[PDB]
Every structure is written in structure tokens, then in C-alpha cells.
Amino acid sequence: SMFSHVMVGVNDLEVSKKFYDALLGTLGIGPGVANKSRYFYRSPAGTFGITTPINGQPATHGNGSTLGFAAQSPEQCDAFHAAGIANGGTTCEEPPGFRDLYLAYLRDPDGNKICALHRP
Amino acid sequence: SMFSHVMVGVNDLEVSKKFYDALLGTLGIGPGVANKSRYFYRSPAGTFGITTPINGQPATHGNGSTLGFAAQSPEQCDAFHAAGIANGGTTCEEPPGFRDKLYLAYLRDPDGNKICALHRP
């Protein structure tokens, strides 16, 4: 992988662990593993983590930031979207579908924009 | 790869292109390729992109967010760090070094996005 890891800030570690456990579970990842004020979601080719921000201030999303997780099929993209929505996330404007790629976009409980992407 | 792609928001695409060209070139990642109001940095396992935010509002960086680029050695992590400082980025703390075993070099890009290069021996 190009990326060793990606971290996002969260305001409530348990609420976000519940979200990402469900979300990333649809892709075969997780559940999250605690390490200090973080949960890590690890695999042979990448690590994702959620953290309390080190500066002690509220976590926020970055406008223009998107984190894309690879999915093995369009069905996994759909399942990712449904699971995130049912467990604290919110839908983006674009419904899951093909883009001239298959993509499903969501925001996590803190507004971090995420995406499952499948290329057939 | 777990990640298909990562985008960050930037407020000046050409300024950021010149930073990331320099920075990611040290890891062997070829220069940015235009596509709409974005530049993409593709490899065989993952794509990184810099973008003007699609909502037309200013780019910001999220408190708690860190993006890590894989590097093949500690020397590459240091070359990354140097290129970053030479081209508009700022160092964070701590300075580059080993940490429990990993080598890490941290920067902020010209927009305040927090990034690092990481090597695991």
C-alpha cells in the first residue's frame, strides 16, 4: 500500500467504535482494538485508526478530506452504506451507484467523509 | 490495500502540487496528474489526491486526522521530511526518529494537513 495508515479524530471513542465496527465489518475488517485513547483496525495492507485528538480540543472533519476503503464488490459498497447509516453515520448527497467504479459515500458521527470503492 | 484512495483539501492547487510532487517524488510517486480541480498521485496500490473542496468552501484539516505514507527506509522518511521543509511545509514535533519499532517523520503541508512518512524495519 501507498499508505501506512490513516487516522481520523473522533469525539466519542465508543460511539465511533460502534460505527466503524459495523461499517468496516461489511468489508471483513475490525472490530477495533484499543490502544491508549485510540482504536485500530488493522490488516496485512493498511491500518486505520480513530483517536481522541492529542491537543485536547474537539475532533472535527477536514473539508476536502475523503477516506476511501477498498471493497470487493458493489454489494459490499451497498452494505457499507446501510451499516454506517444504521450505526450513527449519515448519508451523503449521492446515493451508492456506478460513476463513469462503484462508490458509496457516508459521513461518520463526527462528519469525517468516507467512501467504499469497488472497481470490477 | 485497505484504502482505495485518500483525498485532502487544499486552498491553492498549484502550490500544493509543487509540495506533493517534491514530497512524494522522494518515495518514487510520479508527479500529480490533473483531473478537474484535483491532482492525483497514483501507484499500483492506492491513490492520493489533493482537491479544491467540492462544496466551494475553504479547505480545512480535521483535528485528529493524520495521513501516513509508507516509506522503504528511514533515509526515505528523512528525504521526505527534507523535501517537505524545502517546499512549503512545516515540521511538527517530535522531529523524525524511531519510535516503538517504527521510523516516523511528521509534517504539515502548506494547508495544515498533518502527514507523515513511516517505515517499519
mmCIF file of C-alpha atoms in Angstrom:
data_model
loop_
_atom_site.group_PDB
_atom_site.id
_atom_site.type_symbol
_atom_site.label_atom_id
_atom_site.label_comp_id
_atom_site.label_asym_id
_atom_site.label_seq_id
_atom_site.Cartn_x
_atom_site.Cartn_y
_atom_site.Cartn_z
ATOM 1 C CA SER A 1 0.000 0.000 0.000
ATOM 2 C CA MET A 2 0.939 3.651 -0.656
ATOM 3 C CA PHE A 3 -0.408 4.395 2.788
ATOM 4 C CA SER A 4 0.995 3.058 6.032
ATOM 5 C CA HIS A 5 -2.022 4.268 7.984
ATOM 6 C CA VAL A 6 -4.803 6.811 8.238
ATOM 7 C CA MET A 7 -6.139 8.316 11.494
ATOM 8 C CA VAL A 8 -9.284 10.393 11.939
ATOM 9 C CA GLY A 9 -10.316 12.347 15.024
ATOM 10 C CA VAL A 10 -13.456 11.338 16.928
ATOM 11 C CA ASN A 11 -15.263 12.965 19.857
ATOM 12 C CA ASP A 12 -16.519 9.760 21.354
ATOM 13 C CA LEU A 13 -14.422 6.657 21.028
ATOM 14 C CA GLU A 14 -17.181 4.147 21.889
ATOM 15 C CA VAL A 15 -19.802 5.748 19.669
ATOM 16 C CA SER A 16 -17.268 5.789 16.798
ATOM 17 C CA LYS A 17 -16.024 2.245 17.521
ATOM 18 C CA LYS A 18 -19.645 1.056 17.209
ATOM 19 C CA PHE A 19 -19.927 2.911 13.856
ATOM 20 C CA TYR A 20 -16.624 1.689 12.368
ATOM 21 C CA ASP A 21 -17.107 -1.857 13.713
ATOM 22 C CA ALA A 22 -20.378 -2.073 11.762
ATOM 23 C CA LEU A 23 -19.103 -0.118 8.780
ATOM 24 C CA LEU A 24 -15.834 -1.910 8.282
ATOM 25 C CA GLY A 25 -17.310 -5.292 9.302
ATOM 26 C CA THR A 26 -19.185 -5.336 5.952
ATOM 27 C CA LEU A 27 -15.711 -5.386 4.322
ATOM 28 C CA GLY A 28 -14.246 -8.062 6.580
ATOM 29 C CA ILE A 29 -12.306 -5.670 8.819
ATOM 30 C CA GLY A 30 -12.324 -4.975 12.604
ATOM 31 C CA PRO A 31 -13.600 -4.982 15.269
ATOM 32 C CA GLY A 32 -11.455 -2.133 16.580
ATOM 33 C CA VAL A 33 -8.600 -2.873 19.026
ATOM 34 C CA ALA A 34 -7.895 -0.423 21.851
ATOM 35 C CA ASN A 35 -4.528 1.248 22.229
ATOM 36 C CA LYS A 36 -4.499 4.227 24.605
ATOM 37 C CA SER A 37 -7.196 6.666 23.513
ATOM 38 C CA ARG A 38 -7.438 5.015 20.057
ATOM 39 C CA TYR A 39 -8.992 2.074 18.291
ATOM 40 C CA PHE A 40 -7.111 0.438 15.420
ATOM 41 C CA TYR A 41 -8.469 -1.536 12.534
ATOM 42 C CA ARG A 42 -5.580 -3.494 11.092
ATOM 43 C CA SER A 43 -4.999 -5.714 8.081
ATOM 44 C CA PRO A 44 -1.972 -7.000 6.101
ATOM 45 C CA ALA A 45 -2.059 -3.917 3.846
ATOM 46 C CA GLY A 46 -3.197 -0.946 5.946
ATOM 47 C CA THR A 47 -4.125 0.326 9.356
ATOM 48 C CA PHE A 48 -6.979 2.667 10.128
ATOM 49 C CA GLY A 49 -7.391 4.317 13.498
ATOM 50 C CA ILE A 50 -9.749 6.594 15.361
ATOM 51 C CA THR A 51 -8.328 8.855 18.045
ATOM 52 C CA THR A 52 -9.118 11.459 20.577
ATOM 53 C CA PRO A 53 -7.258 14.473 19.261
ATOM 54 C CA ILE A 54 -3.927 14.937 21.075
ATOM 55 C CA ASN A 55 -4.445 18.689 21.541
ATOM 56 C CA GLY A 56 -7.435 18.121 23.901
ATOM 57 C CA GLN A 57 -9.880 20.054 21.660
ATOM 58 C CA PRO A 58 -12.917 18.599 19.863
ATOM 59 C CA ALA A 59 -12.347 16.427 16.823
ATOM 60 C CA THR A 60 -13.524 17.912 13.532
ATOM 61 C CA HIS A 61 -13.643 16.821 9.906
ATOM 62 C CA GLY A 62 -11.474 18.347 7.197
ATOM 63 C CA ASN A 63 -13.321 19.912 4.309
ATOM 64 C CA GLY A 64 -11.932 18.300 1.133
ATOM 65 C CA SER A 65 -10.720 15.246 3.013
ATOM 66 C CA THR A 66 -12.221 11.836 1.977
ATOM 67 C CA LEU A 67 -11.032 8.444 3.072
ATOM 68 C CA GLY A 68 -11.801 5.643 0.600
ATOM 69 C CA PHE A 69 -11.826 1.995 1.740
ATOM 70 C CA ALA A 70 -11.488 -0.726 -0.943
ATOM 71 C CA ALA A 71 -14.443 -3.092 -1.234
ATOM 72 C CA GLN A 72 -14.615 -6.429 -3.091
ATOM 73 C CA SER A 73 -17.933 -5.848 -4.831
ATOM 74 C CA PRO A 74 -20.801 -3.348 -5.395
ATOM 75 C CA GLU A 75 -22.860 -5.326 -2.883
ATOM 76 C CA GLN A 76 -20.190 -4.661 -0.228
ATOM 77 C CA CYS A 77 -20.418 -0.934 -1.071
ATOM 78 C CA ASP A 78 -24.175 -1.062 -0.556
ATOM 79 C CA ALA A 79 -23.829 -2.996 2.683
ATOM 80 C CA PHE A 80 -21.154 -0.490 3.945
ATOM 81 C CA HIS A 81 -23.566 2.389 3.318
ATOM 82 C CA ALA A 82 -26.525 0.658 5.075
ATOM 83 C CA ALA A 83 -24.437 -0.413 8.053
ATOM 84 C CA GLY A 84 -22.929 3.026 8.599
ATOM 85 C CA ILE A 85 -26.312 4.702 8.386
ATOM 86 C CA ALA A 86 -27.820 2.250 10.906
ATOM 87 C CA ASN A 87 -24.984 2.853 13.398
ATOM 88 C CA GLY A 88 -24.528 6.516 13.769
ATOM 89 C CA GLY A 89 -23.403 7.775 10.260
ATOM 90 C CA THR A 90 -25.152 9.967 7.761
ATOM 91 C CA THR A 91 -25.648 9.627 4.022
ATOM 92 C CA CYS A 92 -24.009 11.998 1.518
ATOM 93 C CA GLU A 93 -25.982 13.557 -1.330
ATOM 94 C CA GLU A 94 -25.024 10.944 -3.898
ATOM 95 C CA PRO A 95 -26.649 7.554 -3.403
ATOM 96 C CA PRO A 96 -24.404 4.478 -3.817
ATOM 97 C CA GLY A 97 -24.063 3.708 -7.532
ATOM 98 C CA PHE A 98 -21.694 3.455 -10.553
ATOM 99 C CA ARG A 99 -19.730 6.607 -11.550
ATOM 100 C CA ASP A 100 -18.250 6.750 -15.024
ATOM 101 C CA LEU A 101 -16.302 2.461 -10.494
ATOM 102 C CA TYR A 102 -18.880 1.655 -7.861
ATOM 103 C CA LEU A 103 -18.967 4.152 -4.890
ATOM 104 C CA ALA A 104 -20.842 4.582 -1.662
ATOM 105 C CA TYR A 105 -20.189 7.714 0.378
ATOM 106 C CA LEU A 106 -21.131 8.456 4.040
ATOM 107 C CA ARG A 107 -20.048 10.658 6.962
ATOM 108 C CA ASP A 108 -19.061 9.263 10.295
ATOM 109 C CA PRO A 109 -20.625 10.611 13.565
ATOM 110 C CA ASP A 110 -18.114 13.493 13.554
ATOM 111 C CA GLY A 111 -18.528 14.452 9.897
ATOM 112 C CA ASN A 112 -15.448 12.654 8.520
ATOM 113 C CA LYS A 113 -16.264 11.773 4.924
ATOM 114 C CA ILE A 114 -15.636 8.175 3.951
ATOM 115 C CA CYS A 115 -16.288 6.077 0.909
ATOM 116 C CA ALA A 116 -16.255 2.399 -0.106
ATOM 117 C CA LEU A 117 -14.969 1.931 -3.604
ATOM 118 C CA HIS A 118 -15.066 -1.088 -5.874
ATOM 119 C CA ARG A 119 -13.520 -1.415 -9.320
ATOM 120 C CA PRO A 120 -14.851 -4.526 -11.277
ATOM 121 C CA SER B 1 -4.510 -2.220 0.315
ATOM 122 C CA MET B 2 -7.224 -1.383 2.825
ATOM 123 C CA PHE B 3 -7.550 2.070 1.300
ATOM 124 C CA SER B 4 -8.572 2.664 -2.339
ATOM 125 C CA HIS B 5 -7.740 6.346 -2.050
ATOM 126 C CA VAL B 6 -7.252 9.362 0.210
ATOM 127 C CA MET B 7 -8.076 12.968 -0.713
ATOM 128 C CA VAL B 8 -7.151 16.073 1.236
ATOM 129 C CA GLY B 9 -8.448 19.582 0.695
ATOM 130 C CA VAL B 10 -6.152 22.356 -0.431
ATOM 131 C CA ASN B 11 -6.726 26.099 -0.904
ATOM 132 C CA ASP B 12 -4.142 26.503 -3.691
ATOM 133 C CA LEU B 13 -3.816 23.626 -6.042
ATOM 134 C CA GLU B 14 -0.588 24.713 -7.766
ATOM 135 C CA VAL B 15 1.191 25.485 -4.519
ATOM 136 C CA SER B 16 0.110 22.024 -3.192
ATOM 137 C CA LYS B 17 1.045 20.241 -6.441
ATOM 138 C CA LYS B 18 4.558 21.598 -6.133
ATOM 139 C CA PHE B 19 4.805 20.475 -2.475
ATOM 140 C CA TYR B 20 3.442 16.921 -3.144
ATOM 141 C CA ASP B 21 5.486 16.481 -6.363
ATOM 142 C CA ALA B 22 8.588 17.190 -4.317
ATOM 143 C CA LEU B 23 7.453 15.252 -1.285
ATOM 144 C CA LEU B 24 6.065 12.112 -2.793
ATOM 145 C CA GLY B 25 8.768 12.044 -5.510
ATOM 146 C CA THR B 26 11.150 11.027 -2.694
ATOM 147 C CA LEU B 27 9.025 7.857 -2.310
ATOM 148 C CA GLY B 28 9.039 7.279 -6.038
ATOM 149 C CA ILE B 29 5.466 8.534 -6.578
ATOM 150 C CA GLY B 30 5.411 10.365 -10.083
ATOM 151 C CA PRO B 31 4.058 13.830 -10.313
ATOM 152 C CA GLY B 32 0.472 14.909 -9.871
ATOM 153 C CA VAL B 33 -1.927 14.436 -12.848
ATOM 154 C CA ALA B 34 -4.791 16.901 -13.332
ATOM 155 C CA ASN B 35 -8.394 15.966 -13.285
ATOM 156 C CA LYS B 36 -10.971 18.696 -12.778
ATOM 157 C CA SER B 37 -9.967 20.703 -9.661
ATOM 158 C CA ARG B 38 -7.687 17.894 -8.399
ATOM 159 C CA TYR B 39 -4.301 16.388 -8.808
ATOM 160 C CA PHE B 40 -3.881 12.631 -8.412
ATOM 161 C CA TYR B 41 -0.813 10.683 -7.367
ATOM 162 C CA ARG B 42 -1.375 7.107 -8.407
ATOM 163 C CA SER B 43 0.553 3.933 -7.615
ATOM 164 C CA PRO B 44 -0.202 0.271 -8.097
ATOM 165 C CA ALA B 45 -1.683 0.087 -4.572
ATOM 166 C CA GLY B 46 -3.508 3.321 -3.690
ATOM 167 C CA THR B 47 -4.138 6.801 -4.994
ATOM 168 C CA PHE B 48 -3.605 10.071 -3.177
ATOM 169 C CA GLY B 49 -5.322 13.250 -4.246
ATOM 170 C CA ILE B 50 -5.360 16.950 -3.486
ATOM 171 C CA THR B 51 -8.611 18.763 -4.177
ATOM 172 C CA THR B 52 -10.453 22.028 -4.126
ATOM 173 C CA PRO B 53 -13.403 21.109 -1.837
ATOM 174 C CA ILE B 54 -16.490 20.241 -3.872
ATOM 175 C CA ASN B 55 -18.781 22.411 -1.646
ATOM 176 C CA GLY B 56 -16.971 25.579 -2.731
ATOM 177 C CA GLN B 57 -15.970 26.366 0.843
ATOM 178 C CA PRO B 58 -12.368 26.643 2.107
ATOM 179 C CA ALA B 59 -10.301 23.562 2.690
ATOM 180 C CA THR B 60 -9.668 22.737 6.302
ATOM 181 C CA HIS B 61 -7.997 19.943 8.084
ATOM 182 C CA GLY B 62 -9.758 17.779 10.683
ATOM 183 C CA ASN B 63 -8.462 17.840 14.286
ATOM 184 C CA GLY B 64 -7.335 14.205 14.980
ATOM 185 C CA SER B 65 -6.645 13.395 11.341
ATOM 186 C CA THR B 66 -3.194 12.140 10.214
ATOM 187 C CA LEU B 67 -2.251 10.644 6.864
ATOM 188 C CA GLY B 68 0.685 8.217 6.722
ATOM 189 C CA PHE B 69 2.707 7.432 3.589
ATOM 190 C CA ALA B 70 4.699 4.171 3.508
ATOM 191 C CA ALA B 71 8.425 4.528 3.031
ATOM 192 C CA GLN B 72 11.058 1.853 2.264
ATOM 193 C CA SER B 73 13.615 3.101 4.776
ATOM 194 C CA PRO B 74 14.390 5.633 7.436
ATOM 195 C CA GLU B 75 16.546 7.527 4.886
ATOM 196 C CA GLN B 76 13.428 7.873 2.691
ATOM 197 C CA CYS B 77 11.473 9.192 5.634
ATOM 198 C CA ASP B 78 14.214 11.772 6.198
ATOM 199 C CA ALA B 79 14.300 12.724 2.431
ATOM 200 C CA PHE B 80 10.521 13.189 2.587
ATOM 201 C CA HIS B 81 10.832 15.397 5.628
ATOM 202 C CA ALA B 82 13.563 17.462 3.970
ATOM 203 C CA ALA B 83 11.631 17.865 0.746
ATOM 204 C CA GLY B 84 8.620 18.939 2.778
ATOM 205 C CA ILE B 85 10.510 21.621 4.622
ATOM 206 C CA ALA B 86 12.159 22.799 1.406
ATOM 207 C CA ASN B 87 8.824 23.257 -0.369
ATOM 208 C CA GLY B 88 6.398 24.981 1.931
ATOM 209 C CA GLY B 89 5.609 22.535 4.678
ATOM 210 C CA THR B 90 6.354 22.876 8.348
ATOM 211 C CA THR B 91 7.724 20.273 10.754
ATOM 212 C CA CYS B 92 5.634 19.169 13.704
ATOM 213 C CA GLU B 93 7.051 17.532 16.745
ATOM 214 C CA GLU B 94 8.707 15.322 17.555
ATOM 215 C CA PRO B 95 11.478 15.536 14.992
ATOM 216 C CA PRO B 96 11.987 12.473 12.739
ATOM 217 C CA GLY B 97 13.100 9.380 14.587
ATOM 218 C CA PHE B 98 12.464 5.897 15.788
ATOM 219 C CA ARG B 99 9.504 5.151 17.978
ATOM 220 C CA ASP B 100 8.276 1.823 19.476
ATOM 221 C CA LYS B 101 9.706 -0.416 16.080
ATOM 222 C CA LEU B 102 8.991 2.364 13.525
ATOM 223 C CA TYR B 103 10.703 5.292 11.967
ATOM 224 C CA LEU B 104 8.447 8.312 11.501
ATOM 225 C CA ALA B 105 8.807 11.795 10.031
ATOM 226 C CA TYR B 106 5.930 14.238 10.575
ATOM 227 C CA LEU B 107 4.954 17.404 8.654
ATOM 228 C CA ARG B 108 2.097 19.756 7.967
ATOM 229 C CA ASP B 109 1.512 20.515 4.328
ATOM 230 C CA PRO B 110 1.001 24.148 3.214
ATOM 231 C CA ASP B 111 -2.697 23.873 4.200
ATOM 232 C CA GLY B 112 -2.082 22.451 7.688
ATOM 233 C CA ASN B 113 -2.894 18.847 6.677
ATOM 234 C CA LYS B 114 -0.930 16.581 9.050
ATOM 235 C CA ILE B 115 1.084 13.916 7.221
ATOM 236 C CA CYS B 116 3.982 11.575 7.894
ATOM 237 C CA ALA B 117 6.213 9.056 6.274
ATOM 238 C CA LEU B 118 6.503 5.745 8.126
ATOM 239 C CA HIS B 119 8.934 2.916 7.753
ATOM 240 C CA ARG B 120 8.761 -0.400 9.649
ATOM 241 C CA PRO B 121 12.189 -2.223 9.651
#
